[PDB]
């Protein structure tokens, strides 16, 4: 089939995980003696692909007769090494993070959608202020807390854990 | 010289700080075997 | 006024020139009003009135009591292509850009 169009679109976490052949769990590149790639690291052949044509990492399968077979001992597919140019990996985040293109490209698409100013979006994203999702009927300065309110740190402490003081 | 203000102890020594490159007779240098020249720079003079 | 490559770039980018001419938004007749310390030019239609306040040392292209088209230059200098487009329309701006580039 002949290429006619080229489409570009946002990628969903599911789409990204679908590209991925494995998660990169360690910040390891290659071993200081063997110079071979480390397990679960950035160059691991278990994820990205074989370094040699049709040869697994440990060497149990070294020929093209095995194609698509994943060696059980070392976990490396037997296939062309060119795939180390193509196969993606991924990193699974303990907490989500904002794609800075959609933050700092003014006017911010994320900030435009949520009617948040640049300053406010910065303050929430880089942890200078809280944004309220549910007030649970909180009250600050007599005004009830409304959703999407910008709370400083003192305000959030005074509302969430109460007010107090200690005197010498 | 090292001087403890309280102890008054004074220990002095000639410490070796490494090498400084020397200029040759003609005003050039030899850095890693290659002759090099330090070019004077023009700039705005300090002042008011 | 600008010559050469700066003028060409100024035109191809549709920039508002630094020293720009002042043009008439509509037709009308020219009534000049010059105090010794201040200057203004009025384009008076049959039913409408337009007042252009400009610095005193600007050179007029315009005699008192002349009939000026919409988008016609009153002061000397380059024309803002966007003012010309709003006043006189597309064909006029196409003409202006092509001729002004060709001058250089």
């Amino acid at each position: 089939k002949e290429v006619r169009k080229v489409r570009i679109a946002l990628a969903s976490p599911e789409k990204i995980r679908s590209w991925s052949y494995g998660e990169v769990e360690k910040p390891e590149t290659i071993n200081y003696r063997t110079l071979k790639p480390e397990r679960d690291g950035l160059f691991d052949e278990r994820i990205f692909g074989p370094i040699k044509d049709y040869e697994c990492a440990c060497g149990k399968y070294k020929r093209q007769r095995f194609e698509g077979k994943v060696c059980e001992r070392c976990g490396v597919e037997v296939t062309k090494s060119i795939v180390r140019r193509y196969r993606m990996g991924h990193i699974e985040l303990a907490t989500p993070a904002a794609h800075i293109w959609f933050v700092k490209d003014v006017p911010s698409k994320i900030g435009t959608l949520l009617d948040l100013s640049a300053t406010e979006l910065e303050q929430v994203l880089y942890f200078s202020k809280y944004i309220v999702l549910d007030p649970k009927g909180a009250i600050l300065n007599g005004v009830p807390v409304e959703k999407r309110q910008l709370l400083t740190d003192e305000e959030y402490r005074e509302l969430r854990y109460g007010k107090q003081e200690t005197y010498p | 010289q090292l001087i403890h203000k309280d102890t008054g102890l004074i220990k002095e020594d000639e410490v070796f700080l490494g090498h400084i490159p020397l200029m040759t007779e003609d005003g050039s240098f030899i850095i890693n075997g290659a002759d090099r020249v330090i070019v004077s720079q023009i700039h705005r003079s300090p002042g008011v | 006024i600008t010559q050469g490559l700066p003028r060409v770039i100024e035109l191809f980018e549709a920039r508002r020139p630094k020293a720009k001419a002042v043009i008439s938004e509509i037709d009308g007749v020219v009534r000049i009003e010059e105090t010794e310390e201040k200057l203004s030019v009025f384009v008076e239609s049959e039913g409408f009135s337009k007042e252009y306040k400009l610095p005193k040392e600007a050179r007029l292209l315009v005699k008192d009591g002349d009939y000026v088209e919409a988008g016609q230059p009153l002061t000397r200098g380059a024309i803002d292509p966007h003012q010309l487009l709003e006043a006189k329309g597309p064909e006029a701006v196409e003409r202006y850009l092509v001729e002004e580039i060709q001058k250089v």
Partner: protein
């Protein structure tokens, strides 16, 4: 000027060493690491514009 910069680094290391380590037994040699000054001279002569 590059000598002055390398010396500033050597002195920052000198104070960092004066806070750590035995307070009773310190020489000029134990205090001074020449490497940052060396580095400053080396970069000025090898990679300066």
């Amino acid at each position: 000027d590059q000598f002055r910069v390398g010396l500033a680094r050597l002195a920052r290391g000198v104070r960092e060493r004066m806070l750590m380590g035995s307070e009773d037994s310190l020489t000029p040699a134990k205090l001074v690491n020449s490497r940052p000054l060396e580095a400053a001279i080396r970069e000025f002569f090898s990679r300066s514009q």
